[PDB]
Structures are given as C-alpha cells and as structure tokens.
Amino acid sequence: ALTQPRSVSESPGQSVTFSCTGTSSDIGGYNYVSWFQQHPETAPKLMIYEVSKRPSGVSDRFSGSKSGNTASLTISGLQAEDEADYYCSSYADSNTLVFGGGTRLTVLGQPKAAPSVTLFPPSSEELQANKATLVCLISDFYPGAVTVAWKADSSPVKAGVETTTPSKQSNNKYAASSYLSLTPEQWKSHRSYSCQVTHEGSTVEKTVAPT
Amino acid sequence: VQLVQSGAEVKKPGASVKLSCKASGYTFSIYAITWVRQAPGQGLEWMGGIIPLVGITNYAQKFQGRVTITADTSTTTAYMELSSLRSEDTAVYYCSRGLGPSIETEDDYDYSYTSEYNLLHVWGRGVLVTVSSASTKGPSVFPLAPTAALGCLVKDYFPEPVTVSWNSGALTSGVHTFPAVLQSSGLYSLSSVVTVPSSSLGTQTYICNVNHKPSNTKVDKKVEP
Structure with missing residues (x-):
C-alpha cells in the first residue's frame, strides 16, 4: 500500500512532516523505511534510511520516525530548496519493495501573482487543414496551480480539451497552455469562445470570435 | 561511485527494450542493483534487481514473464530487458545500487549473503522509454x-x-x-x-x-x- 498525503505546504522556517501508512508486513513488519526527495526532471535522492538514519550529506533538518504501520518525515526549518516530491519506501514479505504515492511539498516563498492569459483562435491556415485549434496560454503566475474552463457561447464545453501541467519559468513563476481542438464547422457554429483561467480563486477570462 | 545509464530510447508497442546500467568506482559483482521505474508524472515503481556475482534475480509479479534482469561482470554492466512493451510502459527507468554489499566473504573465504539491506542509494540518471505507435513526423x-x-x-x-x-x-x-x-x-x-x-x-x-x-x-x- 504505502499511502501518503497527496501534498503538503508550509512556510519557510516552519516544521513540516509527512505520513507513510502501510500494512503489518510493509512498514511495521520491518525497520527498512526510507524517504526520498525528488526534484522535477531529476533522479530521487535518499534522505532517510532504516526508519530514522540520515545518510551522509543530508541536512540535520530531515528526521525520520515510525509508530506502528506509519512512518514520518519531518523537515524543520523549511527552506525554498526543500520544494520537491517526497516518497517513502520499505521492504515487504516475499522479498519485495513497495513505494508510496508521493507528497508535493511547496514552500510559499513568493507573493500571489495572478496568471497572464492570452487566447488565439484557429488560424485560417490551420482551418484550411480541417482543424480548428484554440490555444490558451497562461504565464507569469504563482503558485503554480490554475484551473482552465472552456466556454462556447458562455456554455461550458469539455469535449476535446487538453491542458499541459504547470512548469517553472526562469523568473520562478509558472506556465501552462490549454488547447481546445474543434472541427472547422464547430469553430464557426458559435459566436464566441472563452478561456477562463482561475488562480487562487481569482479568475481571468479571454474570449475570441470567428469574425 | 556512478551508475552510467544509456541514452533515450523509443519503442513501438509489442516490441522489446533492453536497458543498460554500467557502474564504476566500486566492486560491481557483490553490490546488488535494482531497477525502479517512474511513469511520467507518477510515483516510483519497483521492478526487480540482481546480485551480479551469483546472478540471482528477484522480480515483481507485475512484470513476471516480461522483465529479465541480467549482468555481465566482464563489463560491470547490468541490463533490464522489458518485453511486450505497452503504451502504459512509457516511463523513466532508474537503476540503483545499495548502500553496502549484498554478498560478503566471511572468513573461510566462503560467501555469505547479507540481510535485506537498504538497496536504493546510488541512482542512475535514468532513461526515458516512450512506448507508442506514433511514428516520426514533422511539425x-x-x-x-x-x-x-x-x-x-x-x-x-x-x-x-x-x-x-x-x-x-x-x-x-x-x-x-x-x-x-x-x-x-x-x-x-x-x-x-x-x-x-x-x-x-x-x-x-x-x-x-x-x-x-x-x-x-x-x-x-x-x-x-
């Protein structure tokens, strides 16, 4: 099993802990529970091993514990560099290795910045190809969590929408793009289309028309 | 010291992929190497491992029949071949080496297996294996x-x-x-x-x-x- 909280957030300088729940043969069965820190696009790094050991080079902030079938990873004096996913691991009967889901630790080290949304209609050159792709671009916002909803004539439309996951920009902001793929007939069948991006309760709307 | 992993590989569904994990800086044979897979935007997954000196493999039931972990100590390289690739098998493949040896001479210079060590300490850069039927196409x-x-x-x-x-x-x-x-x-x-x-x-x-x-x-x- 190795169930973990989906994500955890805290302020810098404040302690933060993670939970790692398991069965009798997973965590409580053996004292080989270890925690890993993985930054995006990088290999995971071992922070704690054998439940509470801390391999050489790990800052004394990280500390592992265990009480029954649940382990815990605690990061006191939380810093910005501690922003990454954390996984727990543990041996199991039958000579097996089990992993946890992973917790997304975010340090609120930046002020709230609303997203910048631009909407592009299907290009006539693209329409000649029998494809009407609406491109919605979100950039320069923090924290990197937004929700995008597509409206056609103020009516919601969830058909054929794919939105990329937010990433890290050079300025430590976040970026994301949403594409509404319509047929040429559909793009012209509605007066206008809207791309609403909601960020921290604040929502921004940008609309286009076939014109 | 290091686990040099292969480049990037892309395969069609139903094909086979064989990954290589070449180690340097330690005695390859005694230390155990396990393969951990992480699908794009997903949690880590355990596949298996091998002790090169005695060539003992321990797979995960999720991959029995397909995965085949091997190792040629002549070149201190371990290989994990996954057969019957699937679109769902697309992921980043890691190889990790334990903190300490899994086989030890004990006096009497006979071998003796250590016990259930930590086994994920030194990681490789990883290899992306995108399994899809889409062929190369220009934008x-x-x-x-x-x-x-x-x-x-x-x-x-x-x-x-x-x-x-x-x-x-x-x-x-x-x-x-x-x-x-x-x-x-x-x-x-x-x-x-x-x-x-x-x-x-x-x-x-x-x-x-x-x-x-x-x-x-x-x-x-x-x-x-």
Missing part, C-alpha cells in the same frame, strides 16, 4: 497572428523535442516557449509566443524558426497582422 507550423502578442503553433509532431527561435535567434525578449501537450492522437503539440510593441507590428517582421531533429525538419514561418 506543421501555423501562424498565430496578433502591447501586441503573436506566436507560432507547432502542431502534430513526434517525438520530442522541437526548438523554436524567433528572427533566427535575434528576438530574445519577452518570449515564452510553452511545454508541449501530448494529445489523444499520440502527437505532441507546442506553442511559442512573443510580446512586442504594437507599433512595430507593421514594421518589424517576425519569423519563428522551428527545428525538429527526429524528423530532420526545419521550418521558418512569418507572423503578420
């Missing part, structure tokens, strides 16, 4: 015509990546190159826009250079109001 660049904003749409291309540069590398201010989106057709689509003065729309010509090494395609596109 179709479409202009996104226009404080004014304009950009290029790079649609229906495969596989990664495509490099976009405006004015053949000249314009490099206020330019966002968003991540690509993998659609249900299996072909990535990417967008790139710039922020330029409204007055210069009719005076400065903006060209986006799209390059795609996988399909040996280079495109130059002009965006005008």
